Design a binder for this molecule. Structure first.
Ligand code: FES
Ligand SMILES: [K+]
Ligand SMILES: [K+]
Ligand SMILES: [K+]
Ligand SMILES: [Mg+2]
Ligand SMILES: [Mg+2]
Ligand SMILES: [Mg+2]
Ligand SMILES: [Mg+2]
Ligand SMILES: [Mg+2]
Ligand SMILES: [Mg+2]
Ligand SMILES: [Mg+2]
Ligand SMILES: [Mg+2]
Ligand SMILES: [Mg+2]
Ligand SMILES: [Mg+2]
Ligand SMILES: [Mg+2]
Ligand SMILES: [Mg+2]
Ligand SMILES: [Mg+2]
Ligand SMILES: [Mg+2]
Ligand SMILES: [Mg+2]
Ligand SMILES: [Mg+2]
Lengths: 86, 97, 74, 72, 48, 23, 128, 137, 58, 122
RNA sequence: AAACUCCAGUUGACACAAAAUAGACUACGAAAGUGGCUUUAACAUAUCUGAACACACAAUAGCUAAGACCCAAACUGGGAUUAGAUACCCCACUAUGCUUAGCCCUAAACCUCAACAGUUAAAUCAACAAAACUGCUCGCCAGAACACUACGAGCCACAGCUUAAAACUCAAAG
C-alpha cells in the first residue's frame, strides 16, 4: 500500500515469451516460500498443528538431505563390475 | 630407549577455522547497502543462513538490523531497493534456473 | 572378489581347498545333509578376508566355532 | 613427529612441488623431506629461532639447485 | 586512558554557544554509512 | 497404548456432569 | 541514595579526576549511568561501614550485603511494576536466601551477625 | 544490451519503449484469480477504467466459473473491449492462486494484447486477520 | 549441509524441551521411494475452445 | 548513557531545516543531554510513503544526533518528538558504538549427532 | 442452495486486531509460557535435598465490572445433505478471543522419564520405547471396577476445585 508499485514480484517478458516469464515468476514465488505460505493461510492452522507440521517438515529435510548425501557418495560405485565372473 | 616413537602434539597440519564474509565487521542498521545484499530482490524476504552463508552470530545481527532499518524508515520491506540491485552477489541462490 | 582367482589357484597348488564363492547356509553345520553322511569336514579354516561383502563377519567364522574347527584369519 | 611442524610450514609456504611422490620406491625423498633434513642439520649448529632458521634453509636449497617457487 | 580520551573528545561536543554554527556545518556535510561486502570478505566502499 | 482406560473415565465424567445438571 | 554527582566506582580512584572539566565529571557520574551502577556504590558503602575486610567478597557477610542491595532493587522495581510476577518471585526467593545466610551467620559468628543486622536494619525473625 | 527481468525504475532514464510509451505509461490489466471466479479489469496508467470482464459476465455459472476455459474466455472478452479503446501493450498484475491465474493471461494474448510484464500482488499478511477455521472433510 | 540433530530430540542427557518429534526413527533405510506416476491433466483444452467458439459463430 | 537519535525530517528549505535541527538539539539539552555530534545523511526518497501529522511524505532529510543523557530523558524526548510537526520519524536507540563486538575465532564445525538410537537390531 | 447486489474491480485515505520471511536457528524463563520495533527496569542462592495444604505463580476455557470492533467464532438462525442429521458442508451473527481491575486454580499442565552427584566395566538388556547403571534424598504406588464418585473438611470457587472412601460385583483387568 505504502510502497512503490511495479517493483516487487515483477518480471519483464522477453520477446513476447509470456510462458517463460510466468514460469520464472512462479519459480521466484516458490523458492521464497510465498506460494506454500499462501496455501497454508487459506484456513487457520492452529498453533499445535503448525508445530506438528514444522516438526514433520524439518525431520523430512534431515532424512532427505542425508539420503541424497549417501546417493551422491555411492554413485561412483555404479560403474561396471570389474571382477565379472568371481 | 628408541627415538623414533611418536610424540604427543596438536595436529600441526590443522587448517584455520573458516570465517564468514562478515567476521569481524560491524553490522549497522544504517548501512542499508550491506543489508540489502541478504534480502530477496523480488519479495524483500530475508534469506536464511543456508543461502547467505553467514555464521549464526552474523545471521542474527543481520536479521535484527534489517527489522530495525525497515521500521525506522531506512529500508523497504516488500522489495529490494533497486539502487542496490547491482551490488556484489554474495548469496547462493539462482532464480533464473 | 578381487582375489578369488588368486586364492583358488593357491589352494589347488598346495593341494588344499578354497571357498571363495557365496557361502550357502549350512555348509558346515548341515554338511552331512548337503554333502553326505560320511563327509569329512575341514580340520583348519584360514580366512584371508574375514568380512563378507556387506562389511560384516563372514558367516563361516561363527559356524567354524560351532563345529569346533580352529580358524586362522587376517 | 617433531618434523611434522616443519613439514606443515613448508607445505604452507611452498606447497607440494611439481615433483610427484613415488610411493613405490621405499627410499624416495621428496623435496619436503630434503628440506626437513637440511633444516634439522642447521638446527644442530645452534640456531634457536624458527624464522631465521627457516629462511636460511631455503637459501641452502637454492644454492644446491632446488626449485622453490613460493605460493606468492 | 579512557578519561584522557574523553577529555579530548569533549572539546568538540556541541554546546549552546556553537549550536548554530554546528548546525550550519552539518547541513553542508554528508556522512555515508553504506558499504558492500564481497564473496571474499572485502569491503567495497561507495564511489560517489 | 490404546485409550480404553481414558474412554471409561470419559463416559463416567460425561454422565456425572449430566446428572449434576439434571439435579 | 547516592547523590547523582557521585562518580562511578570505576573512575573514583583514577588520579586527577577532581581536576577534569565539569562536562567530563557528569559524564562519569551516576546521573549519566544506568541503575545498576548506583547499586554498585550502595554495595561499596555498606561494605566499608559493616565488613571488617571491605575487599573480601566471598565471606558470608559480604554476600548478605550484596543480596540485601538486590532485595532493595527488587522492592523498588515492584513499587512501579506491581503485576510483575517474575520479579515478585525473585524478591521472595532472595528474602528466603538472605534468611538462610543470616541463620548460618548467627550460628557461626554471632558478633558479626549483630553488626549485619544493625548496619542493614534487618530484624531477624525465627521461623514458625 | 542484455535483457533485464527487473522492471525499469520510474525515476531513472530507460531506453525501453513500447509504441513510443515508457513503462510507466502502459495500461495495466488487473487479474483477480479467485478459487471460484476470475475478474479482469484493464485500466490506463492514470487509473482510468477501460475494460472489465469476468467469468460471470461471460455466462458461466457456479462451479463453471472456476475453470481455466472460463477465465480464458473472460481474458478474450476483456482484450476485445480494451483493444477498441486503443490498448495494445498491457502490464499484467495478477492477484490470487485461482484456477484462472494463467488462463486469463492466455485469453488476453489470444485477444490481441501484448503482455510486457507480469507482477504478482497476492495479499500476504505479515502476521493480520485470523482466517476461517479448517474444513473437516 | 544437513541440519543439526544435536540436542533436538527428547533424551536423558538433553535438558531442553525437544525441538523435533519424529514419528519414525531418524535412521536411513536401505531403499528409496518408488517413482510417482504423474497425475494427468485434460489436454487440448485451448484448441477445443477455439473450435467450439468457431462453431458458435458459424 | 550514550544514545543515537535517527531523525527523519520533512523535506524543507535550508532555513527551516536549520531551525528544526536547532529546536531538536535544544530539547535534548533542556532534558539534561550532552550532545556529542550532528551528522547529515542527506535527503532521499523514503523507503515507503509515511503519513505524519496529517501529511503524506515521500521524501525526507535523514539526520543523526549522537548524545549522552540520563535514562529518564529518553521517554521525555520521545514525547517531544511526537508533537513536532516537522519530524517524519524519530527513533532513539542505544548508540551502536558503545557495544563491543566480541572477537570471533571462526566457525566451529559440529559433527553428525551419534548414539541417538540404541544399537539393538530392529 | 441460501446469502449479497447499500455489490464488485482499480486508486486514495485509514486500528485498543494480529505479529510473513529470518528460523535448515535451538535461545530465554521456575513452570505455565516466550519469535514486529524502541527505550527503562530486570532475570534469587559460593554444598545439596526439602510441602496436594505454608508462600508465590500457573495455557485454554470460564466468572464479575468497565471499554474496544478488523477478523475469527461455541450458541442460534437460514441453506444443503440424510431414513432422521439436534452433525460433518455453505451463509449470517452472538458469548468469547483484546484492554483495564479483580476472581477462578484446571489440562494428554506429558519430553507421561523427579532433584543433586557420578559411571560406560561387569550379568548390557523381559518386550516396546528415548542404551544400561551407581550413590543420595524427597514425593508417590501395592488386582479390576465401583471412583476425576459418596460423606467430611477447606476454599472470593455455590452446575466449582482440592483432599478422597466403603458396600455389593468379578477372576480377571492390564
Ligand atoms: S565466523 Fe566470525 S562472526 Fe561469522
Ligand atoms: K512479524
Ligand atoms: K494433573
Ligand atoms: K506429551
Ligand atoms: Mg496407534
Ligand atoms: Mg462407568
Ligand atoms: Mg509415535
Ligand atoms: Mg439464489
Ligand atoms: Mg517460519
Ligand atoms: Mg531447596
Ligand atoms: Mg505431604
Ligand atoms: Mg489461569
Ligand atoms: Mg477472559
Ligand atoms: Mg465475521
Ligand atoms: Mg464480539
Ligand atoms: Mg505444555
Ligand atoms: Mg524434588
Ligand atoms: Mg477433572
Ligand atoms: Mg468431586
Ligand atoms: Mg462435599
Amino acid at each position: 500500500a505504502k510502497h512503490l508499485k511495479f517493483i516487487a514480484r515483477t518480471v519483464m517478458v522477453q520477446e513476447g515469451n509470456v510462458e517463460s516469464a510466468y514460469r520464472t515468476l512462479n519459480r521466484i514465488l516458490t523458492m521464497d516460500g510465498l506460494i506454500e505460505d499462501i496455501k497454508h493461510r487459506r484456513y487457520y492452522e492452529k498453533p499445535c498443528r503448525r508445530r506438528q507440521r514444522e516438526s514433520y517438515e524439518r525431520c523430512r529435510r534431515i532424512y532427505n538431505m542425508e539420503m541424497a548425501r549417501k546417493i551422491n557418495f555411492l554413485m561412483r560405485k555404479n560403474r561396471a563390475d570389474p571382477w565379472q565372473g568371481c | 630407549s628408541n627415538e623414533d616413537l611418536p610424540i604427543s602434539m596438536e595436529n600441526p597440519y590443522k587448517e584455520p577455522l573458516k570465517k564468514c564474509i562478515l567476521c569481524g565487521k560491524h553490522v549497522d542498521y544504517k548501512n542499508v547497502q550491506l543489508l540489502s545484499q541478504f534480502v530477496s530482490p523480488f519479495t524483500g524476504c530475508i534469506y536464511g543462513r543456508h543461502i547467505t552463508g553467514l555464521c549464526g552470530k552474523k545471521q542474527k545481527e543481520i536479521t535484527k538490523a534489517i527489522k530495525r532499518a525497515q521500521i525506522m524508515g531506512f529500508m523497504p520491506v516488500t522489495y529490494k531497493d533497486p539502487a542496490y540491485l547491482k551490488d556484489p552477489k554474495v548469496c547462493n541462490i539462482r532464480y533464473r534456473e | 572378489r578381487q582375489f578369488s582367482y588368486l586364492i583358488e589357484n593357491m589352494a589347488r597348488d598346495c593341494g588344499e581347498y578354497a571357498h571363495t564363492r557365496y557361502f550357502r547356509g549350512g555348509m558346515l553345520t548341515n554338511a552331512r545333509l548337503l554333502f553326505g553322511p560320511t563327509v569329512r569336514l575341514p580340520d583348519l579354516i584360514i580366512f584371508l578376508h574375514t568380512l563378507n561383502n556387506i562389511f560384516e563377519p563372514h558367516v563361516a567364522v561363527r559356524d567354524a566355532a560351532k563345529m569346533n574347527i580352529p580358524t586362522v584369519g587376517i | 613427529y617433531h618434523e611434522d611442524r616443519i613439514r606443515a610450514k613448508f607445505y604452507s609456504v611452498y606447497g607440494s612441488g611439481q615433483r610427484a611422490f613415488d610411493l613405490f620406491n621405499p627410499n624416495f625423498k621428496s623435496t619436503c623431506q630434503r628440506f626437513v633434513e637440511k633444516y634439522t642439520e642447521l638446527q644442530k649448529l645452534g640456531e634457536t629461532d624458527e624464522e631465521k632458521l627457516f629462511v636460511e634453509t631455503g637459501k641452502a636449497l637454492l644454492a644446491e639447485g632446488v626449485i622453490l617457487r613460493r605460493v606468492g | 586512558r579512557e578519561v584522557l580520551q574523553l577529555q579530548e573528545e569533549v572539546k568538540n561536543f556541541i554546546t549552546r554557544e556553537n549550536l548554530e554554527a554546528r548546525v550550519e556545518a552539518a547541513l553542508d556535510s554528508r556522512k555515508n554509512y553504506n558499504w558492500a561486502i564481497t564473496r571474499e570478505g572485502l569491503v567495497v566502499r561507495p564511489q560517489r | 497404548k490404546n485409550v480404553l482406560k481414558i474412554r471409561r473415565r470419559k463416559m463416567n465424567h460425561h454422565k456425572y456432569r449430566k446428572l449434576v445438571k439434571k439435579t | 541514595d547516592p547523590p547523582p554527582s557521585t562518580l562511578l566506582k570505576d573512575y573514583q580512584n583514577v588520579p586527577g579526576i577532581e581536576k577534569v572539566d565539569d562536562v567530563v565529571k557528569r559524564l562519569l557520574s551516576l546521573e549519566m549511568a544506568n541503575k545498576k551502577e548506583m547499586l554498585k556504590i550502595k554495595q561499596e558503602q555498606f561494605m566499608k561501614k559493616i565488613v571488617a575486610n571491605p575487599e573480601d567478597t566471598r565471606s558470608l557477610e559480604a554476600r548478605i550485603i550484596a543480596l540485601s542491595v538486590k532485595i532493595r532493587s527488587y522492592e523498588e522495581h515492584l513499587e512501579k511494576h506491581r503485576k510483575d510476577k517474575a520479579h515478585k518471585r525473585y524478591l521472595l526467593m532472595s528474602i528466603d536466601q538472605r534468611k538462610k545466610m543470616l541463620k548460618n551467620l548467627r550460628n557461626t559468628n554471632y558478633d558479626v551477625f549483630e553488626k549485619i543486622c544493625w548496619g542493614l536494619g534487618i530484624e531477624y525473625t525465627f521461623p514458625p | 544490451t542484455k535483457f533485464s527481468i527487473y522492471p525499469p525504475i520510474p525515476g531513472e532514464e530507460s531506453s525501453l519503449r513500447w509504441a513510443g510509451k515508457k513503462f510507466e505509461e502502459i495500461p495495466i490489466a488487473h487479474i483477480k484469480a479467485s478459487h471460484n471466479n476470475t475478474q479482469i479489469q484493464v485500466v490506463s496508467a492514470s487509473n482510468e477504467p477501460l475494460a472489465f470482464a469476468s467469468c460471470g459476465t461471460e455466462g458461466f455459472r457456479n462451479a463453471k466459473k472456476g475453470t481455466g476455459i472460463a477465465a480464458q474466455t473472460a481474458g478474450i472478452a476483456a482484450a476485445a473491449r480494451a483493444k477498441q479503446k486503443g490498448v495494445i501493450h498491457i502490464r499484467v498484475v495478477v492477484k490470487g492462486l485461482g484456477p484462472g491465474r494463467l488462463s486469463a493471461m492466455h485469453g488476453l494474448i489470444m485477444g490481441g494484447l501484448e503482455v510486457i510484464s507480469i507482477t504478482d500482488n497476492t495479499p500476504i499478511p505479515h502476521x493480520g486477520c485470523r482466517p476461517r477455521k479448517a474444513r473437516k472433510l | 549441509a544437513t541440519p543439526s540433530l544435536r540436542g533436538r530430540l527428547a533424551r536423558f542427557g538433553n535438558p531442553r524441551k525437544p525441538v523435533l518429534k519424529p514419528n519414525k526413527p531418524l535412521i536411513l533405510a536401505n531403499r528409496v521411494g518408488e517413482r510417482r506416476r504423474e497425475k494427468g491433466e485434460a489436454t487440448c483444452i485451448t484448441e477445443m475452445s477455439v473450435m467450439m467458439a468457431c462453431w458458435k459463430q458459424n | 548513557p550514550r544514545y543515537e537519535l535517527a531523525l527523519i525530517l520533512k523535506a524543507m528549505q535550508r532555513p527551516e531545516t536549520a531551525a528544526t535541527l536547532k529546536r531538536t538539539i535544544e530539547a535534548l539539552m533542556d532534558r539534561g543531554a550532552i550532545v556529542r555530534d550532528l551528522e547529515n545523511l542527506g535527503e532521499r526518497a523514503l523507503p515507503y510513503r509515511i503519513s505524519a501529522h496529517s501529511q503524506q511524505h515521500n521524501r525526507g532529510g535523514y539526520f543523526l544526533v549522537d548524545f549522552y543523557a540520563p535514562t529518564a530523558a529518553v521517554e521525555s524526548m520521545v514525547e517531544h518528538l511526537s508533537r513536532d510537526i516537522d519530524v517524519i520519524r524519530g527513533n532513539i536507540v542505544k548508540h551502536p558504538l558503545t557495544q563491543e563486538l566480541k572477537e570471533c575465532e571462526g566457525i566451529v564445525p559440529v559433527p553428525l549427532a551419534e548414539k541417538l538410537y540404541s544399537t539393538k537390531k530392529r
